[PDB]
Amino acid sequence: YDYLFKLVLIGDSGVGKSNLLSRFTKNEFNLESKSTIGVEFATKTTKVEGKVVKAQIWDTAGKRAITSAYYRGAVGALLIYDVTRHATFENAARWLRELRGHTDPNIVVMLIGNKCDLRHLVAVKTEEAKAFAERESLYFMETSALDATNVENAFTEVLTQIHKIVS
Ligand SMILES: Nc1nc2c(ncn2[C@@H]2O[C@H](COP(=O)(O)OP(=O)(O)OP(=O)(O)O)[C@@H](O)[C@H]2O)c(=O)[nH]1
Ligand SMILES: [Mg+2]
């Protein structure tokens, strides 16, 4: 734990939060996936622009005054929606204002369109998502936990920019 960056994943149920966490930390995809009970953790150590960082990534259910303990100390946040279900992207702003009720204004937040491997079912055009990120100063990437496309880039990018702030 040279420096340990706590990151929280948030977003509605079944957007792929847990599988995202699984593919980044252990490189595996839980097909047999159940809704997350409580909060689960997973760490990974990587070196961002030349300084070894430990990420300590928190995960919970999309569904208890545990929110404050959930967000406490988070210096990063992945706002995940499900590219194929427009209702997941719509209440991302509602996750966003909860995430800013319980964190610092300078947290590094990436909006994430997960499941980009389901190309024939995409219900969210990337320019409405890019518009929402522009409007809110969010980073943004499309990802597939199933294919691993952009998962590492999503996390390391967050980690790198966290590093630039506190370095
Ligand atoms: N095709 C495809 N399916 C995915 C992808 N990521 C997740 N899924 C599926 O979507 C379902 C939800 O996965 P989870 O990671 O458990 O969903 P979640 O966001 O963690 O939901 P909660 O933990 O209950 O809040 C699972 O059945 C996955 O198989 C993806 O990238 N591509
Ligand atoms: Mg889960």
From Swiss-Prot:
Keywords, alphabetical: Cell membrane, GTP-binding, Lipoprotein, Membrane, Nucleotide-binding, Prenylation, Protein transport, Transport
Principal localisation: membrane
Subcellular location: Cell membrane
TM ranges: none
Motif, Effector region: chain positions: 33-41
Binding positions (GTP): 11-18, 59-63, 114-117, 144-145
GO cellular component assignments: cytosol; endosome; extracellular region; plasma membrane
Annotated phenotype, changing residue 114 to I: Decreases GTP-binding
Source domain of life: Eukaryota
Keyword flag DNA-binding: no
One GO process term, biological-process aspect: cell wall biogenesis
UniProt key word Glycoprotein: no
Effect of disrupting the coding gene: Slight increase of primary root elongation and lateral root branching and hypersensitivity of root growth in response to exogenous auxin.
Family that this chain belongs to: Belongs to the small GTPase superfamily. Rab family.
Purpose: Involved in auxin-mediated response. May be involved in vesicle trafficking of components involved in polar auxin transport. Binds GTP and GDP and possesses intrinsic GTPase activity.
Miscellaneous information on this protein: Plants overexpressing RABA1A show reduced growth of roots and shoots and smaller leaf sizes.
Protein name: Ras-related protein RABA1a
Gene: RABA1A
Residues of the full protein shown: 10 to 179 of 216
